[PDB]
Symmetry: D2
Subunit: 115 residues, 4 copies
Amino acid sequence: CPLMVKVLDAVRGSPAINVAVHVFRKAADDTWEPFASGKTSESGELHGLTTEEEFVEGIYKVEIDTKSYWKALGISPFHEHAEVVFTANDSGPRRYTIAALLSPYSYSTTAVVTN
Amino acid sequence: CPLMVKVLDAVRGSPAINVAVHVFRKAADDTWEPFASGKTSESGELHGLTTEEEFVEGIYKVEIDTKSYWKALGISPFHEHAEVVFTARYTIAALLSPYSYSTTAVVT
Amino acid sequence: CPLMVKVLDAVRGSPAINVAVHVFRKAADDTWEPFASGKTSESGELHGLTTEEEFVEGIYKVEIDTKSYWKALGISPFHEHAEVVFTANDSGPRRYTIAALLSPYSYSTTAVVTN
Amino acid sequence: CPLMVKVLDAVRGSPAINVAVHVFRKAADDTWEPFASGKTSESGELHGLTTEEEFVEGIYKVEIDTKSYWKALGISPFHEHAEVVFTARYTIAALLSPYSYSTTAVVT
Ligand SMILES: O=C(O)c1ccc(-c2cc(F)cc(F)c2)cc1
Ligand SMILES: O=C(O)c1ccc(-c2cc(F)cc(F)c2)cc1
């Protein structure tokens, strides 16, 4: 249950559906290694990215493919993607929700971290 | 200027121009009385609302007519307007989308 | 299920718990009439404000008592409250989620409206 | 100026001052090469990053070191930094909180 991504659309007032998300974890040599990926559901949520055992301490990047999302609607957006980079699990296991709110020339993101 | 409003459009990536803004001060009977108003400029800014002399401590409401703004672009928006209510340099900034806005105060 | 409010805290990375919310509906004479109220739960959600039958077409104001929230933490915030004013159900019944993200000198809000 | 960055602090309601900002351009082999950098001023602004001559079409990354900013205020923040990636007047604005940020592009 440890990592979840939620994406909303501020233009349509809806979940952002079928948004591709890629998660990377920084490796020893400081390269970004592929960690997990998926697509948001009809409710704009992405679950089952990882397990408690696999989501170890480290620096993670969640890249939300906002450009493919807007291009799929028809709209030539500003950003290539929205990145969320963070250290995770560095004082033990936490549950992380990464939420993003998308517009063609703006996005926000926030984290909810619980124990 | 003691009070400035700045309005940006999050969809087009542009200042939000010609947006109506009305400011009210809270009266003793808890009603809102008109204080100042204007339209945003080509840079999405509204200055000249008040002077330091008039802008005393009080509760103020800044109402931004986001609904007319979006309608004129052909978009049905969600909010009737965007209201920012605070007690009192103040900059009230607003970033608009059809179903969302944000607002921040830069008090310098 | 027709009206829900979700509030997050951007300072703590947590749901905003025990935030008071008052909902008003504009009356014939253009006064704001009390409609519903409650407090956000431990997950920062507020459900059971109204029923499909009672939530008729109209203009509604959802006032989120952000100042009492921050004052309860210790922080003297900028805003008195966050207001969300909107016309509801004017092309039939919709389900409305009103979400807000709070910081002492800033908030955002977004609507998710589904059918 | 073709490119300006502006950074605001959503908690204190202030410009975010002395924030490090680094800009990278995407190279042909898909790597990020350094382009320009600076610290935000007392108004939370960074100008002088580039000239029109140098700022050609390309994919750019603006990295804002939000983590050092928050740490210096005694706050453990969530993000390592805030990255804004786009293809190319550009203003990149960022509004910061410890567990949240937003960003917008005002292209005028
Ligand atoms: O919370 C937001 O979405 C947000 C709100 C306002 C701004 C912003 C505020 C300013 F005063 C100037 C600017 F360029 C951008 C940037 C982001
Ligand atoms: O800063 C914002 O605009 C913003 C970003 C995300 C959310 C949000 C996050 C969630 F996990 C759920 C929700 F309903 C809304 C609400 C507002």
